[model samples]
Target chain A: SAPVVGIIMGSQSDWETMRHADALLTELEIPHETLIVSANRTPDRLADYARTAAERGLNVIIAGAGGAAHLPGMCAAWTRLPVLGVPVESRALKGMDSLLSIVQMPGGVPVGTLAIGASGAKNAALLAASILALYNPALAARLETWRALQTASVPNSPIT
Target chain B: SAPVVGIIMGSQSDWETMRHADALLTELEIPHETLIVSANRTPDRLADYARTAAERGLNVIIAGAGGAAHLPGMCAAWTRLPVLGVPVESRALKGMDSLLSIVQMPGGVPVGTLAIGASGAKNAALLAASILALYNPALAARLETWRALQTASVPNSPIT
Candidate 1:
C-alpha cells in the first residue's frame, strides 16, 4: 500500500545489478518500489517521479545505472530525500563512466555513490535501512540483528 | 626480490584503503612493491615513475588515491601495462571525487577502475593477479585455489 523506499535505474540492462538492492530490501521487509526511470530517455518521467518522491511517501532513493549514469544526480536535484547511486559494471569500461557521471555532482546537488556492481547495490539497501532506522525503531532492531549476524557469520579463516 | 607489480598511492592517508590491495597481493604471494608518490604535488615524480614502470619490469600498476585521484589514469597514460585504479574513501565525499578523477579517462587513456575503498583495493590486486596468471601457470593454480577458498568460505545463512 505505502512504500518508504524507491529503487530506480536507467535501463532494463541494469536490472541484473539492481536486483540485489531489491532482494536485500525485501529481505529486511522494507516497503519499497523498484522500476526503471531513465534520465536520458524519459526526462519528464524522471522529473515527475523525483518531484513527487517526497510527497509519495518515499524516504530514500536508490538509483543504479551504467555508462554515463545520470539518474541518481538528476533525481537528487528534484527531491529532498537522500539519493544513493550504484555504478553498474559495463562491458567496455566496467562502470567507470557510470561511476563518474552519477557520483561527481557539483556542489548544489548530491548523490551518495556506492561501490561498483553487486557490493554497491547491497550496501545501498543497507545504507537505506540505516537512514530509515533513524525514525523507525522496529526496523532499526531488525537491521542491527541483520548486521550482527553478518559479522558473526564471517569465518575466522578461509578453507584451503 | 625484484617486484613485478607496483602499488603506488598519492598520500599516506590513502594507505587505510590501499592497504587492502597490498595485503591481497601479498596473500597471493605476488611480488609487489607499495609506496607513496603524489601526483599533484610531484607531477614529475609520477611521470618519471610511470614512464619507467615498463622498462623496470613491472607487469601491472595498482594505483590508489582519494579526492581528485589522478594517479591511475596518469600512470596508464605513461605505461603500456594494465593500470588498475582504486578510489580510496575520502573524508568529505567518501571517494566520489576520487573515483571520477581516476575512472573517467578520455577515450585514449585507459584506467581500469575498481569499487571504492577496501573492496576496490582488494579487487585491484585480484585483477592484477588475473592479468599475471595468463603467462604463469603456477600462479594461475594458486589464484584458482584462493578463489575456490573464497567461494567455499561463504556461510550458507546468516547467524541469527
Candidate 2:
C-alpha cells in the first residue's frame, strides 16, 4: 500500500513518547509505519530514507525526537516532502531545548512544529492528516467526522 | 515589607523549577518570596494566599506545578494580579499534561504560561521582570541591560 504518513523517531527508546502518534493515527485510520533512524547515530540511514521517502508514496513524514533532536530539520533538509516535528519531552529540560531546536529552523526548509511531548505527537499526527487531506477527499471527510466526535465527547463543564 | 512577586509551588520537588524564578529575580534585582503550597495538597492555603495576593502588595505571582497542575489557575481565579504559570516537567507525560494544565486556562482567568522546563522557567522569570518593569524604572533598566548583554554575548558564528 502507498503510505501517506511516515512516523520516524530518533531511537526505539522513544516508543513511549511516540506511541501517541501511533494511537492517534490508529484512531484516524491513517496508515503509518514507524522507523528508528537517528540523525547523529545513523546519518546514512536517515539520509537514505529521506532521499527516497516520497518515491515510496509518502506524502508527509512525522518525526519525533528528544534532547537536541535534529532528525526532523535534517530530514526536511534532505527531502522536499513536508516534515512535521514533534519535540519529545526531555529529562532535565522538559522538552524546551527540543521545542527550540525543532521550531527555530532557518529559512527555505520548514517543519510544522507542534507542542512538546504526547499532545504534540498527537497534533503532529492530526496535522499530517490535515495536510494529506488537501489531496485526499475521504480523509477530509473522516477528519470532519473526527472533529465533530471530539467536540461531542467533551463534557459541558468540569466534573462536579 | 511585602514582596512584589509571590512564588508558589505544588511540591518540594518544584523547588527546582522555582529556582529559575529565583535566579531570574536575582539577576533582575526584583523583590520576591516563595511558598510551599500545593493546589491538591493545600487548597485552603492556595485559596487564602490567592485571595489576598494583590492587597498584600504582590504585583505578580509566579506558580510552578507538575502533573495536572491547577495552582496557577486557582490563584488566577482568586485574584486579578497577573499570574505567571510555570509548567514543571513531570515524569509520565514529560510535562505535556503540566503544560496544558498551565496553558489552557479558562478565558475569564488568564495565566501567562511559558514553555515546559528550564527555558520556560527562565522565561517566566523574565516575564515577571517585564511585568514589574511597568512601574519600576530601576527594574526596567535592569531588564534592558540583561537583554542587551544577552545579545552582546552571542558569538559571531558557531565555530563548528
Candidate 3:
C-alpha cells in the first residue's frame, strides 16, 4: 500500500508525542508511514527519506523533535515538500528551546511549525489533511464532516 | 484609579491586540492601566515604569510587542513582578520572530509568554488575573465565574 503522508521523529523518545500524528491520520484513513530519523544521529537517513519523499509518492511530511531540534529544519532543507514541524516538549527548558529551534530558523522557510508537544503533533496531521483536501474531492467531504463533528462534540459546560 | 495590573505595548500598532487584554480586564472589574512605552523609542520610560511597578501597587505586568519584541524582557529585567508577554503578530514573519524574541531569551526567565496576536494578549491578561487571584478572594470568585461562562459558551455545533 502506498502512503500519502510521512510522520518522522528525532528518536524513539519522540514517538510518545509524534504518535498522535500517526493516530490522527489513521482515524481519517489517510495512508501514512511513521519512523525515527534523528538529524544528529542519523543525518543520512533524514536526507534520503526527505529527498525521496515526493518521488516516493508522499505528499506531505510531518517532523517532530525536542531541545535544539534540528531534525525538522534539516528535513525541510533536503525536500521541496511542505514540511510541518512539532516542538516536542522537553525536560530542561520545558521545550522553550525546542519551540525556538524549530520555528525561528532563517533558511528553513519550508518548515511551518505548530504549538509545543502533543497538541502540536495532532494539529500537524490535521493541517496535512487540509493540504491534501485541496486537490481531492472525496477528502474535502471527509474533512468537512470531521470538522463539523468536532464542532458538535464540544460540550456547553465542563463536567464537574 | 489605583491599578493592580499594568498593560504595556511596544507601539500604537500593538493596540489592536493589546486592547483585547484591556477589554478582558475591564470586563472582570480588574483595575489596570494601559499605555504605549516602546523599549526602543523610550528606553527610559520603560525602565522607569517597570522599575516602579511594584512600588506603584501593581501586582502583575502584561507586555505586548511585535518584530524585535524587547519590551517584555527588558521590563522583566527591571522588575521583580510577574511579567507575561503577548507576541503581537508581525507583518513579515507573522509573529514567528516576535514569538521567539519574547519567548526564547535566557535572562528573561521572569517573562512568561503566550500565543501570538490578540488571543495571546487576552490570555496574558487572564493569566495576570490568575496570579492576582492568589490573594484576592473577591477577584477569585469573579475569575471562576468568567471561566465557567466561557466553558458554557462554546456552541455544540457549527453555525452555517
Candidate 4:
C-alpha cells in the first residue's frame, strides 16, 4: 500500500528515537514508511524529499530530529501536508533545543506538537492516527479499541 | 552586601550548567550563592535549603537540574520566592525530560521557565538580574548600561 504516513529522521543516529514512531504505527496497523533526511547533514536531499512527499501519496509526515533539529520545520515549509515534529533527544542540550525548534513554529505554519523523544515519537503516530481517523472509519474503530485496552489496563488499587 | 540571588544545582555534575548562572550573577554584580542539591538524589537537602532561602535574603532562586529534573519545581513548591528553572542537558535524552518535567508544573506552583542548555542558563541570569533591578537601583542602572553596550556591539547585518 502507498504509505499514508512518512517517518523521516534527521540522521541514522536518530533511529533510536524514531523507532518509537515505527513501533506505534505498527501497533496501530497504519501503513507507513521511514527515511533519513537530515536538515544540516543533507540539506539538498531534505528539501527535495519534502518538496515531493505529497505527490507520493503521503497523507501526513512525521519528522524526528535532534540538536538544531530543522527537519520538521523545513519539511513543513515545503509541503502542504500536515506535519508532526518528534524532537529526538540530543547529546549536549537534551531535546529542549530540538523541542523548541519543532514546537515554536510561526503562527501560520503549524507542526502538531508532542512531548520529546520516544514517547513523543509514539504520540506523533497516535496523533496521526487520530487525524486520519477523522476521515477513515476503520482507523477510528481501531483507535477506540486501543483506548479501551489502555483504560482496561489501569488498575483500581495503588501499587505501593 | 547580602546575596539576593540563589543558585542551586541538582548535582555537582550540574555545576557545569549552574556555573553559567553563577558567572552571569557575577557579571551583573548580583550577590549570589551556590549549593549542590538534587531532587531525586538529595531530596531532603533541597527541601531544607529552599524552605529557608527566602528568610535568609534570597530574592530569586535559580535551580538547574537534569533528566527527570524535579529540583526546580520542588524548590518552588517549598517557597513563595520566584524560582527560575534551567533545564540542564542530560546524557540520555538531552534535557527534554528535564524541560518537560520542569515546564509542566501545575497551576499555582510556577517555575519561571527558561530555554534549554546554555541559552536557557544565560537567560536565567538575565532574568535574575531583571528581577533584582526591580528593587535595587544601582544594579538596575548597571543592567541598563550592559544592555546598551550589548546592543551597540551588534552589527546591522549577518556575515554569509
- Top TM-score: which candidate number? 2
Per-candidate iRMS values, in order, are 14.3, 14.0, 17.0, 14.4
TM per candidate comes to: 0.54, 0.55, 0.53, 0.54
* Candidates sorted on TM-score, descending: 2, 4, 1, 3
Select the stronger candidate by DockQ from 2 and 4.
Answer: 4
Off by over 4 Å in 4: A1-160
lDDT of 4 by residue, B1-160 (tens): 7888889888888887778889988988888988888788778888899999989999999999988889999999999999999998877777779899999999999999897787788889999999889888998999999877754543321120
Worst lDDT 10-window in candidate 2 chain A: A36-45
lDDT of 1 by residue, B18-77 (tens): 999989889888998998999899999999999999999999999999888888998888
CAPRI quality of model 1: incorrect
Candidate 4: residue B106 Cα off by (Å):
0.5
Q: Residue B125 error for model 3, in Å?
A: 14
lDDT of 1 at B141: 98
> Model-by-model lDDT, in order?
0.88, 0.86, 0.88, 0.86
Please give the TM-score for the first chain of candidate 2. Answer: 0.96
Which predicted model would earn the best DockQ? Answer: 4
- Tens digit of per-residue lDDT, candidate 2, span A1-160: 5467888988766778788887888788888787777776567778998999999888899998997889999999999999999999887667887999999999999999999998999999999888877888998999999989999999888978
Candidate 1 runs further than 4 Å off: A1-160
Give per-residue CA lDDT, model 3, range A76-106, as digits (tens).
Answer: 8988999999999888766778889999879
- lDDT, residue B82, model 2: 91
TM-score (C-alpha) between model 4 and the true structure: 0.54
Q: Given the true complex, what DockQ would model 1 score?
A: 0.02
